[PDB]
Amino acid sequence: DIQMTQSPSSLSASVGDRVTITCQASQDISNYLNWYQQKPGKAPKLLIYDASNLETGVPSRFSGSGSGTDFTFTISSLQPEDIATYYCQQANSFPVTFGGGTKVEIKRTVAAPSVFIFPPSDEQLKSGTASVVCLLNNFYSREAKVQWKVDNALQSGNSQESVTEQDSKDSTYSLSSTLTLSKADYEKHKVYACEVTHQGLSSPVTKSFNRGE
Amino acid sequence: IVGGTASVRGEWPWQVTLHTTSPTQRHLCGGSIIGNQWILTAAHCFYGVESPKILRVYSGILNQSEIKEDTSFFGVQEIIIHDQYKMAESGYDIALLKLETTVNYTDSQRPISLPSYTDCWVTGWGYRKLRDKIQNTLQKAKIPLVTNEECQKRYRGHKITHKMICAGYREGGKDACKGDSGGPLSCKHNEVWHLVGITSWGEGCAQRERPGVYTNVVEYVDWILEKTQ
Amino acid sequence: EVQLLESGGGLVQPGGSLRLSCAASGFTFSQYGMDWVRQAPGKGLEWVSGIGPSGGSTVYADSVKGRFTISRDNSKNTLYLQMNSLRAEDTAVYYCTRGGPYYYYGMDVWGQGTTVTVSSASTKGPSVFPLAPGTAALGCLVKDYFPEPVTVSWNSGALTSGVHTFPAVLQSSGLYSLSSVVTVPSSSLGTQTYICNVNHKPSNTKVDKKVEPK
Numbered sequence A: 001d002i003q004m005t006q007s008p009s010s011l012s013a014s015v016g017d018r019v020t021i022t023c024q025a026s027q028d029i030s031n032y033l034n035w036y037q038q039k040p041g042k043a044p045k046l047l048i049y050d051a052s053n054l055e056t057g058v059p060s061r062f063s064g065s066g067s068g069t070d071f072t073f074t075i076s077s078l079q080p081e082d083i084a085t086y087y088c089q090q091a092n093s094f095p096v097t098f099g100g101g102t103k104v105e106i107k108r109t110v111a112a113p114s115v116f117i118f119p120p121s122d123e124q125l126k127s128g129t130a131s132v133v134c135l136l137n138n139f140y141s142r143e144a145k146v147q148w149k150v151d152n153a154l155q156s157g158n159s160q161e162s163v164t165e166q167d168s169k170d171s172t173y174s175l176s177s178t179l180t181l182s183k184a185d186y187e188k189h190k191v192y193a194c195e196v197t198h199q200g201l202s203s204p205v206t207k208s209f210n211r212g213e
Numbered sequence B: 001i002v003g004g005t006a007s008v009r010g011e012w013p014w015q016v017t018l019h020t021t022s023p024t025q026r027h028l029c030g031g032s033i034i035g036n037q038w039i040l041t042a043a044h045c046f047y048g049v050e051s052p053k054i055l056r057v058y059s060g061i062l063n064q065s066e067i068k069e070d071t072s073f074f075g076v077q078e079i080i081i082h083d084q085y086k087m088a089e090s091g092y093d094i095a096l097l098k099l100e101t102t103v104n105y106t107d108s109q110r111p112i113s114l115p116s117y118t119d120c121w122v123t124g125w126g127y128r129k130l131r132d133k134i135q136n137t138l139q140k141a142k143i144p145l146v147t148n149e150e151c152q153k154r155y156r157g158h159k160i161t162h163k164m165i166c167a168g169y170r171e172g173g174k175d176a177c178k179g180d181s182g183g184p185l186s187c188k189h190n191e192v193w194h195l196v197g198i199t200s201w202g203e204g205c206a207q208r209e210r211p212g213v214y215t216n217v218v219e220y221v222d223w224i225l226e227k228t229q
Numbered sequence C: 001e002v003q004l005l006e007s008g009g010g011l012v013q014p015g016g017s018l019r020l021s022c023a024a025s026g027f028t029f030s031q032y033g034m035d036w037v038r039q040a041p042g043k044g045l046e047w048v049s050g051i052g053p054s055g056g057s058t059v060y061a062d063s064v065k066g067r068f069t070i071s072r073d074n075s076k077n078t079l080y081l082q083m084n085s086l087r088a089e090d091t092a093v094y095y096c097t098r099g100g101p102y103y104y105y106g107m108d109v110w111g112q113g114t115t116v117t118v119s120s121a122s123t124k125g126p127s128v129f130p131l132a133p134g135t136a137a138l139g140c141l142v143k144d145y146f147p148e149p150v151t152v153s154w155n156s157g158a159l160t161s162g163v164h165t166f167p168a169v170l171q172s173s174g175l176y177s178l179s180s181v182v183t184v185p186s187s188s189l190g191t192q193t194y195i196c197n198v199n200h201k202p203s204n205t206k207v208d209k210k211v212e213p214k
Helices: A183-187 B148-153 B217-225
Strands: A004-007 A010-014 A019-025 A033-038 A045-049 A062-065 A070-075 A084-090 A102-107 A114-118 A129-139 A145-150 A159-163 A173-182 A191-197 A205-210 B015-020 B026-035 B038-041 B055-059 B076-081 B095-099 B120-124 B139-142 B164-166 B184-188 B193-201 B213-216 C003-007 C010-012 C018-025 C034-039 C046-051 C058-060 C068-073 C078-083 C092-098 C114-118 C127-131 C135-145 C151-154 C163-165 C176-185 C194-200 C205-211
Touching (some): A010 A019, A033 A062, A070 A084, A114 A191, A114 A205, A129 A183, A129 A191, A129 C176, A145 A173, A173 C176, B015 B038, C034 C078, C135 C194, C135 C205, C176 C194
Parallel strands (some): A010 A102
Antiparallel strands (some): A004 A019, A033 A084, A129 A173, C034 C092, C127 C135
8 A cells, every 4th residue: 555755845945946856655656656736725736747747738847757666856947936835646556645745935035024003993892802913914034023012011822823825926925913802901001012023124113003093 | 568668759650549539539549550541450449430530540659648639640531341350369350541641751650561570569558457548658568479389379269370470478578458459560570660460369468478469460461452552 | 628616515513424516517527537635624635536437446545435435427527425424534625636638547637626624513604804004904804713714805806916815813712713914005095995705605604894994
């Protein structure tokens, strides 16, 4: 029963670089080996069949090699559109098995998050809960501290965040922190402050409002 | 082709892939170019093909994936199956296709000559264990013949005739099979490619001491030229 | 042209049953082998079963064998996956695939996928709250739903650039939230109406929200 060892698990490279991904079968599968690209949000798609044959529509920077046990998939010149997880698959015999996948990401010039804060809707407060949102938009690298303050006091544990997968045109990331609180405890305070920190701002950037906009 | 090896563009320009289009376009059989309008192939390949309107012959093909929508092909006007052909195992497994049009030959789509052997190559596409799938890149294997006398001895309850000729290895491992069927046994003799046998039938594929039986083309020459006119 | 749409996904208690379907179009279905590949949440591609052109020859991953049954009917152009004795390890996006052209077996066509969530917890619709305002950010907050997924568009599809729908967060409560937001021209705020179209299939919940600056 044939096992497929893909490597590395994830990688980062700059646009234009050689990228090379490997896939080892636990036994001789000759050239019965396919490669797939799955773009974020989308269904996987087949790029290479039979180890090196490149399917219709696939651009010429993709290629593959190997037979028997060692396979290689390579992107001659990585583009921002190649952001994706790639997967090998033996078609040698049943069951069909895939590699674990290699996450492929883009290095690029640092961009600063552009930072917005959202109060809670009048509509939500009438259901007694108060969700407060910080948007950090289109930044690189993915690294970003967000730090919430009420009447300048550092909050902790009543906040949750989510980063998008990498934009496939501009290679940026976006992040959304949500401070959650009771209508009650939100009403006990005035100054609602979001403190973003990143390698692309000279210094931390604070966005805020007072209740009563 | 079993236990063979990838071929290359230009190499076996008499090899052709004969496709059916109905119900879906796919490789049926091998053929060998023998003249302007003439592919020679096996008769058992037309098992329930009731009309030539569904065949296409592509030449100058290596990868099957090369064949797209807009690729040029030759249609087939007529199917001439040997008058005495009724079953592969009992011989007469020969057939010709008259084309709609003729081959403007090049380097990679030339004809091959007939006979009247030592350097013998079996080519073709041929099947796999798994979704009855067809090998993509035209395969080849070099194989030597076995005397009908030896062949006969290795098929005790079917009858090898003088109009058959056999050819595997004694250890086994190399053969033409279904998909390769109809495809050529081409031999270079005095440095010249003659078309000597046609992949017809067999018991297993590439099995130790069970060699393929090939329509012994040499014995049908006169038959062929009652029609290459 | 060539297309596979799957359906029957949704929510089912552990131990349950569900028949998945796939409507193939734009090809002669009859002649192609077909497989279901699935993908559990964050992620890994896993082959589940396959069936030959003609419906004989069926084949299964060990983890579903004796539980799942693949079948087709070619006179309706439909592939099925009868899934019984379901179990949380079956929660996944289920893809309908075609097993390739005549010269290779691989998955050369995929549908969009359909989500199966095996869990004994109950469906809840999200509430949808506005996130109000060179350029301006606005959004919706899609809060307190189960299971995943929520779909989100803006202006019925006609607004695409600038949009980030954040992956979902799972709260202390055992319920999901997400935000979808978009950045647009500030000039457009006076003129243009910005609606976010939220659809949480497991609770028949199609809700549409005007987001206005305040």
